[PDB]
Amino acid sequence: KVFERCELARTLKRLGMDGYRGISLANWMCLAKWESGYNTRATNYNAGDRSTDYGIFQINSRYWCNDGKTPGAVNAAHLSCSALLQDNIADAVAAAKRAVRDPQGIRAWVAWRNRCQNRDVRQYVQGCGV
């Protein structure tokens, strides 16, 4: 599923992402925009370390989900990476919440540092009624 901007904002809010660990809804929106373009079936194989990023939040298989084919893979979230390619994003959200409970926080995603960090991200939630 490719989410429309405001539809995603409302969904994330209902799922309790607004201000989760100090992270604004606008920041979560910015992350999803650049990671997958709000597409839940987005997958990205990293040829360099043999891991794959899954879903709307591009959650990595070495730490937050198990896909069986990733070397040195840990399962901090305990989810199958398959759960992060569904149309329903409840599992992707729970995984994202777990990921930011590490001291790094949202900075774990380099895309966040490059295009969201220290920027005006209001644009991602403007007009959505959240």
From Swiss-Prot:
Stretches assigned to the C-type lysozyme domain: 1-130
GO biological process: antimicrobial humoral response; defense response to bacterium; defense response to Gram-negative bacterium; defense response to Gram-positive bacterium; inflammatory response; killing of cells of another organism
Disulfide bonds: 6-128, 30-116, 65-81, 77-95
Pfam families (alphabetical): Lys
Family in the record: Belongs to the glycosyl hydrolase 22 family.
Function: Lysozymes have primarily a bacteriolytic function; those in tissues and body fluids are associated with the monocyte-macrophage system and enhance the activity of immunoagents.
Other remarks in the entry: Lysozyme C is capable of both hydrolysis and transglycosylation; it also shows a slight esterase activity. It acts rapidly on both peptide-substituted and unsubstituted peptidoglycan, and slowly on chitin oligosaccharides.
Protein's name according to its UniProt entry: Lysozyme C
Source organism: Homo sapiens (Human)
Gene name of this polypeptide: LYZ
